[PDB]
Amino acid sequence: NPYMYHDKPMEEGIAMLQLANMAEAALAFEAVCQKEPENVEAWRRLGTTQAENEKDCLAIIALNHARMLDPKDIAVHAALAVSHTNEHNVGAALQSLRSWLLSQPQLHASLGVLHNLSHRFDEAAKNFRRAVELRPDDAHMWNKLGATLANGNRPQEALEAYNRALDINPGYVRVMYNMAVSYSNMAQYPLAAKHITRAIALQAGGTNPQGEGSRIATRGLWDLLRMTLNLMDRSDLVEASWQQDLTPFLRE
């Protein structure tokens, strides 16, 4: 299905941003913003919507496109902070945070992200916890509550917050990513394999295959399957993974 034509449910997309998947919502937002991809609102909404479903490669591009035309918005300068912190450009993240603070709730979040950048844990989690107490909502940052703690070699504590972020919005694939990697860091391989298969199925189910379900960012999502290959060493399934059908063994 090479076609790009999709309906324009902007109301439905903003309604489903918490009560449905972030894959169909992302497709709908891309469809509604593809008409005139130059305004600040469409670009910032696109970036915020790609923040949940992991396609940071295009998300960074969208956020930069939003930023270059408005050095005053408080959201576009905030989203770039976390995404760049995760991958790379240490200096660029700091410069972006300085520009974000030079245009005047999320202050503690930015502080904790900056600390998390230069491999600082057990205190950025403290800052997040003191921040989340003031606003025990917006599960988007609850992931951080676990994430910045899950890589600090403390898995059991990181699990709880994860499920807390799961109930509000099931489509926030980052939480299941984190629980999958945490389960993998126990030598209980099925507990992680089941979760990662569920995550890829949900992120690719629905209307994802239709309308060029061959997005390039999905490549960075396929390799995630070949992590526990070392303990799924069966020739039948190792070769099937390079095509990502998921129909074989159907998660059960």
Binding site: V82, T85, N86, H88, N89, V90, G91, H119, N143, A147, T148, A150, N151, G152, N153, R174, Y177, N178, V181, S184, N185, A187, M227, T228, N230
Partner: protein, 323 residues
């Protein structure tokens, strides 16, 4: 002709390693020093030393770290040996599990950048989380597309040096040049085969404290410095000897037998182990059996196998992005 390239030279170990290699390399060799901060200093500080024939080039760093640095990419042309020694020195009072992540990331980036231009060159690891890092290099080499199963080595000569020093101290004036050591590298996987050397060993239950010392020596050194650095000289010297051995074997002027940490094939089911090998004109040429051992060290070897299995599993399954 031959051109060694050290990755990271301005650290507490890179400077000493470069200085040591600047006094044994054969005539007509070449050095290539790269580091993010401090490259010009070592560059126009070792260039003012008289050793005819040797040329000393260098590549400066860049802004705060960015992946795929062009300077390293253009520097790495025409290189035969890579010496990876770039890593975080030590954390103030944190055990090794925390130290794993940053070193894993930096070694992955460095290997990915270096192998994309000169795949045929050999790679020598001299970081610190050895056991769990060599499989990361193997995985990176498999992922990029080129991987020689006979050109990859983890330095482990330091524990052999410690073992032979201790046994020479306990048995003066008798002198032995080398002592075999088998296993992994980190804390307990090391086991020395004292029964495999000539000369009458003194007595049982007297080698037990020696076997404990050859495993607790690193933490003893860290304690002696009051948690403000690691052994930055002793490991800076053994790496020079190993690099010279590799280069000399490449030049064809010697065929040495050395104990290293290399991927297995055939023998013990662990994918990687520290087993004696022989070098030659093209990588490794003949892997050797462990030989006759005693049950007292056989149980230790089995326990070390059990530990290194999980170590390699963790190294292969690190795969951490978290976001």
């Amino acid at each position: 002709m031959v051109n060694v390239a050290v990755i990271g030279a301005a650290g507490g170990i890179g400077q000493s390693l470069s200085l040591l290699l600047l006094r044994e390399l054969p005539f007509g060799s070449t050095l290539s020093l790269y580091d993010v901060v401090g490259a010009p200093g070592v560059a126009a500080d070792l260039s003012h030393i008289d050793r005819a024939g040797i040329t000393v080039k260098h590549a400066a760093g860049k802004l705060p770290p960015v992946p795929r640095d062009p300077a390293l990419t253009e520097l790495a042309e025409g290189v035969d040996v890579f010496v990876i020694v770039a890593g975080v020195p030590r954390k103030p009072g944190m055990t090794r599990d925390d130290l794993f992540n940053v070193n894993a990331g930096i070694v992955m980036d460095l290997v990915l950048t270096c192998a994309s231009v000169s795949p045929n060159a050999c790679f020598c690891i001299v970081t610190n989380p050895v056991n769990s890092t060599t499989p990361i290099a193997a995985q990176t080499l498999r992922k990029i597309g080129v991987y020689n199963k006979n050109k990859l080595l983890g330095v482990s000569l330091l524990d052999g040096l410690r073992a032979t020093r201790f046994i020479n101290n306990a048995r003066h004036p008798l002198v032995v040049p080398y002592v075999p050591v088998v296993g992994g590298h980190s804390d307990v996987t090391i086991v020395p085969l004292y029964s495999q050397i000539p000369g009458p060993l003194p007595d049982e239950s007297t080698l037990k404290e020696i076997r404990k010392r050859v495993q607790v020596a690193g933490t003893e050194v860290v304690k002696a410095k009051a948690g403000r650095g690691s052994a930055t000289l002793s490991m800076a010297e053994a790496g020079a000897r190993f690099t010279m051995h590799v280069v000399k074997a490449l030049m064809g002027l010697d065929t040495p037998m050395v104990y290293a940490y290399v991927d297995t094939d055939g023998e013990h089911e662990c994918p990687f182990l520290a087993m004696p090998v022989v070098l030659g004109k093209n990588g490794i040429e003949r892997r050797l059996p462990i030989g006759p051992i005693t049950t007292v060290e056989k149980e230790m070897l089995e326990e070390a196998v059990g530990v290194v299995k999980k170590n390699i599993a963790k190294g292969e399954t690190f795969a951490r992005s978290k976001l």
